[PDB]
Amino acid sequence: AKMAFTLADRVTEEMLADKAALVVEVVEENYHDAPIVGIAVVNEHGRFFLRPETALADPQFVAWLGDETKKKSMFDSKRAAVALKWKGIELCGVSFDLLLAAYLLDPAQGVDDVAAAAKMKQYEAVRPDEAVYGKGAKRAVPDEPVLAEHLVRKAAAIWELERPFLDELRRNEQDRLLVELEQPLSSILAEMEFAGVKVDTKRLEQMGKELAEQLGTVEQRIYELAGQEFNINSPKQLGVILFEKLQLPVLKKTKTGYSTSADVLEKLAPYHEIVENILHYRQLGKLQSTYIEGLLKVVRPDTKKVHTIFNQALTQTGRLSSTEPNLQNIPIRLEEGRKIRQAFVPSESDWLIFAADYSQIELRVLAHIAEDDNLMEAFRRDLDIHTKTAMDIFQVSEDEVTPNMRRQAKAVNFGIVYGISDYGLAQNLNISRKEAAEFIERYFESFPGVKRYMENIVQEAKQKGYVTTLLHRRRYLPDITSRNFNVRSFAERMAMNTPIQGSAADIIKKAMIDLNARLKEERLQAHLLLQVHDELILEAPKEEMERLCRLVPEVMEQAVTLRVPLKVDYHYGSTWYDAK
DNA sequence: GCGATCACGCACGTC
DNA sequence: GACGTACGTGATCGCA
Ligand SMILES: OC[C@H]1O[C@@](CO)(O[C@H]2O[C@H](CO)[C@@H](O)[C@H](O)[C@H]2O)[C@@H](O)[C@@H]1O
Ligand SMILES: OC[C@H]1O[C@@](CO)(O[C@H]2O[C@H](CO)[C@@H](O)[C@H](O)[C@H]2O)[C@@H](O)[C@@H]1O
Ligand SMILES: [Mg+2]
Numbered sequence: 001a002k003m004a005f006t007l008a009d010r011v012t013e014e015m016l017a018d019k020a021a022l023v024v025e026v027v028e029e030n031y032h033d034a035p036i037v038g039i040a041v042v043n044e045h046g047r048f049f050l051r052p053e054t055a056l057a058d059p060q061f062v063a064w065l066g067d068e069t070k071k072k073s074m075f076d077s078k079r080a081a082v083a084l085k086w087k088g089i090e091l092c093g094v095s096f097d098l099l100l101a102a103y104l105l106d107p108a109q110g111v112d113d114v115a116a117a118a119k120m121k122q123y124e125a126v127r128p129d130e131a132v133y134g135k136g137a138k139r140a141v142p143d144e145p146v147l148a149e150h151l152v153r154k155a156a157a158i159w160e161l162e163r164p165f166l167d168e169l170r171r172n173e174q175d176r177l178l179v180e181l182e183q184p185l186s187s188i189l190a191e192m193e194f195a196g197v198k199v200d201t202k203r204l205e206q207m208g209k210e211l212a213e214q215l216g217t218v219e220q221r222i223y224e225l226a227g228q229e230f231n232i233n234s235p236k237q238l239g240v241i242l243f244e245k246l247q248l249p250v251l252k253k254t255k256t257g258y259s260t261s262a263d264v265l266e267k268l269a270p271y272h273e274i275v276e277n278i279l280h281y282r283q284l285g286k287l288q289s290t291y292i293e294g295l296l297k298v299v300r301p302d303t304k305k306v307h308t309i310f311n312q313a314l315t316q317t318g319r320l321s322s323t324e325p326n327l328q329n330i331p332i333r334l335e336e337g338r339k340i341r342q343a344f345v346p347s348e349s350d351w352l353i354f355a356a357d358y359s360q361i362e363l364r365v366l367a368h369i370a371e372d373d374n375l376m377e378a379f380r381r382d383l384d385i386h387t388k389t390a391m392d393i394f395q396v397s398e399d400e401v402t403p404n405m406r407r408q409a410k411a412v413n414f415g416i417v418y419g420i421s422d423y424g425l426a427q428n429l430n431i432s433r434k435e436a437a438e439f440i441e442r443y444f445e446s447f448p449g450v451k452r453y454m455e456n457i458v459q460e461a462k463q464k465g466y467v468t469t470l471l472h473r474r475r476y477l478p479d480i481t482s483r484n485f486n487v488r489s490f491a492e493r494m495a496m497n498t499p500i501q502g503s504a505a506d507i508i509k510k511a512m513i514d515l516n517a518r519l520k521e522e523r524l525q526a527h528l529l530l531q532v533h534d535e536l537i538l539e540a541p542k543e544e545m546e547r548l549c550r551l552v553p554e555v556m557e558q559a560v561t562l563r564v565p566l567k568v569d570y571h572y573g574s575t576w577y578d579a580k
Numbered sequence: 581g582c583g584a585t586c587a588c589g590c591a592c593g594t595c
Numbered sequence: 596g597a598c599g600t601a602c603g604t605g606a607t608c609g610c611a
Binding site: 262286287319337 | 584585589590591592593594
């Protein structure tokens with residue numbers, strides 16, 4: 001049965017009530033400078049559809065959008081807020097975001113439209129967006145009657161579902177997590193995305209040119225060494241060259257053929273000079289295709305900025321992700337790739353990039369949650385944690401810790417945080433399962449509080465059905481009761497890891513909210529550009545650097561109070577590369 | 581049948 | 596442990 005609404009030709013006062021469900025529809029996946037295709041409002045007075053050209057040109061409607069005392073409930077308010085920012089319109093007063101509510105209640109549902117959220121509460125009187133707009137290439141905005149009914153049904157669902165969602169959040173003790181953390185964060189991310197990051201495209205193009213020259217040389221050397229020409233980028237052609245023509249050992253298999261992962265190739269390098277060249281080719285080609293060509297494709301040519309979109313409602317642990325471009329995986333480990341960061345520059349003359357990162361936040365969170373006396377003392381002394389771990393597991397003095405010992409202890413520390421397993425550690429360190437098991441046993445002997453946490457958290461996951469983070473984010477783990485060893489073991493590792501990774505995510509999100517409040521109080525021009533899981537990147541006038549050196553680390557260190565200190569390192573410079 | 585698209589396995593970049 | 600993008604390849608679709 002059809003849903004009744006007014007297809008309005010002009011904005012009226014009853015559309016401007018002080019509580020409403022609002023839909024401001026942006027169909028393009030990337031909403032930056034994208035069209036708004038229609039607007040729906042549902043409130044005490046009825047249901048309304050407005051054409052955007054009309055509504056967004058109407059002073060009363062625009063004033064209503066920007067009035068913080070006029071409360072709106074929405075789904076994915078950041079998309080609307082950013083699309084409106086590109087049109088110079090402020091959206092304020094969003095008091096409920098159904099996307100973030102659904103995400104907090106259960107991130108595993110993968111809710112990404114109103115219909116998916118609605119089905120959580122047995123409400124089905126709204127179509128999935130994919131049904132209305134189609135998917136992929138065939139995607140398209142439908143004719144007005146179809147569009148208007150869809151937007152009004154979405155607004156009506158939001159209007160109905162706010163109360164039951166808030167009720168369930170309150171039962172879970174997650175209502176403050178929504179209202180005081182995720183919703184305010186959404187506004188901060190909207191500002192970050194809209195500001196964008198300035199790119200030195202000439203520098204990127206120069207790099208592109210160098211890389212292409214190097215790739216040509218290496219490509220030709222590979223042909224020479226192979227005694228043949230082939231698609232180095234093909235798994236089938238390369239496999240025939242390495243494991244048939246050149247007879248290299250097959251040390252590892254993939255589902256459907258020969259593994260050629262770098263870890264495998266590293267092992268084969270002693271047998272034939274072609275291998276080191278394939279590795280080099282892959283290094284350069286990744287930089288060329290993903291970073292140089294990829295970034296240049298998405299830079300806006302007018303302003304030379306890139307505008308990422310942070311997906312706030314995707315990861316199972318409460319981290320953000322970043323897309324189009326992903327600015328959370330710009331190279332840093334190897335110097336050649338690291339130079340890519342020289343192309344990320346401040347957006348104004350005489351400004352600088354300032355970067356601040358937490359030192360070992362996940363192990364500090366683990367020390368806190370596990371109340372492990374040895375680990376807490378280590379951080380209270382601000383020790384090098386990997387050297388301390390080596391001292392304990394290998395039973396030696398600090399002087400006797402060799403580089404290889406520190407390297408292996410570091411890998412153990414990562415294993416412990418990720419959800420230790422003897423097979424996984426063995427693969428990482430390239431040792432036997434028995435040997436890896438001995439490393440883990442020694443670790444738990446030195447850190448018995450961590451051992452107790454790991455046992456207890458798996459038991460809690462089984463008993464309650466989920467694990468929780470410091471600020472009450474939850475992750476359900478139904479596979480924890482599986483009678484399949486591999487399925488169950490993966491869930492156990494999630495039970496161990498999620499409260500650590502997720503609590504670290506909670507802390508940095510709170511730090512962002514606190515930082516923006518402090519920046520506004522101090523009336524600094526500095527602002528956030530990016531978050532990369534445990535680090536915040538800002539730009540500001542050079543004259544603000546001294547103040548930021550004190551202000552940013554303090555805010556990040558004081559965001560929460562743990563049983564150990566939090567420690568933040570910081571650097572600044574004329575490009576992201578130099579903020580090291 | 582011939583591009584256009586979709587789907588998936590794979591490899592590799594970050595924290 | 597958590598992500599996103601690029602690529603090659605084979606399948607499928609879209610329309611005659
Ligand atoms: O707008 C972000 C918000 O939208 C969702 C879908 O509800 O993701 C869409 O937007 C993305 C960013 O452009 C795409 O990466 C994604 O493919 C698209 O479905 C949410 O998942 C997200 O939180
Ligand atoms: O032997 C106990 C030890 O095994 C683990 C897995 O490493 O859990 C297993 O043992 C349980 C009972 O004590 C089950 O509840 C669990 O499902 C099973 O996998 C550890 O958590 C536990 O300490
Ligand atoms: Mg760090």
